[PDB]
Amino acid sequence: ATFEIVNRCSYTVWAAASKGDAALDAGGRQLNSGESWTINVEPGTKGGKIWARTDCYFDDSGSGICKTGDCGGLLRCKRFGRPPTTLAEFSLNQYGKDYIDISNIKGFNVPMDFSPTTRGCRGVRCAADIVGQCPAKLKAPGGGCNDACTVFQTSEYCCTTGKCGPTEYSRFFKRLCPDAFSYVLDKPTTVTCPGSSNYRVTFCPTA
């Protein structure tokens, strides 16, 4: 499957793409404002994620640090990133269908649109000013708005027992972005697409 990753933000982002135990394609790249990066993701990939990292510094060997979404200090991510990270999530060719969603379960750093470039389904977006409206306790100094599980590490926010409910914090993400997962047991906002669809992930789709 092909994914075109577009940075429409006025600032540079370092895109990342991983399935948790391996990079997807190159795994990461710098995207200046307006740049597009096309990646190929193997059919049948389960649990893939794409996210943006902000305020990165990398040396000649691709080692460094980002203020949001750092994946063990690598430019080319092999693992998932440190919250806060708005996430584009996908599982491809699962019994003839692709499943896509946007998640705020690991917080929010950059607004995003995740849409198919092929026919058969709709896209999802979370483009509200979550960082600007972020509750004081969830604000991340490096930038972004953390989820409550990252901040407080309780069974209720992390849904550790598999029984949790919405919270004051999850309702904040849900009010601003109804089409994104706000907590582990949220009513699914997953979109089913035809198997082998192609997609575009756009950072800052409105601004």
What is the number of alpha carbons within 13 Å of residue 116 lying toward its C-beta? 20
Host domain of residue 186: 1-207
Q: What domain count does the chain have? A: 1
Task: Please answer whether residues 68 and 84 qualify as being in contact, where contact means their C-beta atoms are separated by less than 8 angstroms.
Answer: yes
| Experimental technique | X-ray
Q: After which residues is the chain broken (C to N over 2.5 A)?
A: none
Whole-angstrom distance, CA of residue 53 vs CA of residue 34: 16
Calculate Rg over the CA atoms of the chain.
Answer: 16
Whole-angstrom distance, CA of residue 139 vs CA of residue 125: 21
Whole-angstrom distance, CA of residue 139 vs CA of residue 36: 29
Task: Please answer whether residues 89 and 142 qualify as being in contact, where contact means their C-beta atoms are separated by less than 8 angstroms.
Answer: no
DSSP state of 77: -
Whole-angstrom distance, CA of residue 63 vs CA of residue 153: 29
Those residues with Cβ within 8 angstroms of residue 169's Cβ, 6 or more apart along the chain or in another chain: 135, 138, 147, 148, 157
CATH of residue 200: 2.60.110.10
Task: Please answer whether residues 198 and 117 qualify as being in contact, where contact means their C-beta atoms are separated by less than 8 angstroms.
Answer: yes
**130 SS3 class:** helix
**24 — alpha (psi -120 to 50), left (phi > 0) or beta?**
beta
Resolution in A: 1.5
Tokens 């060719």 sit on residue: 93
Task: Please answer whether residues 165 and 77 qualify as being in contact, where contact means their C-beta atoms are separated by less than 8 angstroms.
Answer: no
